[PDB]
């Protein structure tokens, strides 16, 4: 589908083509501090895709509340992506449960198809405008998942740190015929006076996990986040 739902917020417009280059695709931040979301490309960051690999977020935070994940570990399989482990999480949590989490959440178009590997190029579909609110509102505004929980995915998405920031994601490639199809990093950012979540997604071009990165760690650091 097509997220469709408004935005009440008075969101700053960005012009990032240039950093896309050939890609197509969009790019949404929200500070906390400021309480505002920054787009560029809004038509695009409302088309629902496959979120791939980037739903492994979510995974983690059903594995870790139903105490499948406990005491190969987290880190090791959010950092390389191992995809057995949230295929098994995903295989032992009950539909109605995962049903009633994505409600609560907001999440896409909640598509869960034959519930078996519905996050990979399948049912389920999110757009790049919802990747934001929904990580920002699951992490700071939802009182179900737990603080232990939270932190302990926060430690499998770390990727960078040092005295002017912690920068916190994770990648999706989705492959069709032999090549991308479909790139995200969706994340967040801790500096010394703000939070910012964040997401990139790419449409065409060289849609990679990878390129989607990249991409949005030269916006952030041409818009000052990484200052
Ligand atoms: C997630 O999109 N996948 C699992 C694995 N990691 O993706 S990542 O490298 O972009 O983070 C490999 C690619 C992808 C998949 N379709 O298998």
Redesign the pocket.
Known sequence: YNYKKPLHNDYQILDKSKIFGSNSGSFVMYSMKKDKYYIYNEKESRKRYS????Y?IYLAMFGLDRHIINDQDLNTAMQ????WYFERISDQIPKNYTATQLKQLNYGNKNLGSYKSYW??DSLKISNLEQVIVFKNMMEQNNHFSKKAKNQLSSSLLIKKNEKYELYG??????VNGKYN???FVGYVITNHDKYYFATHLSDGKP???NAELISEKILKEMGVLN
Request: hydrophobic content about 15%; proline content about 4%; charged content about 15%.
């Open positions: 979120p791939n690999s980037t492994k390389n992506s191992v995809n990979m190029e994770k990648t999706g490639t989705g492959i479909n790139g995200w990679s996990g990878k």
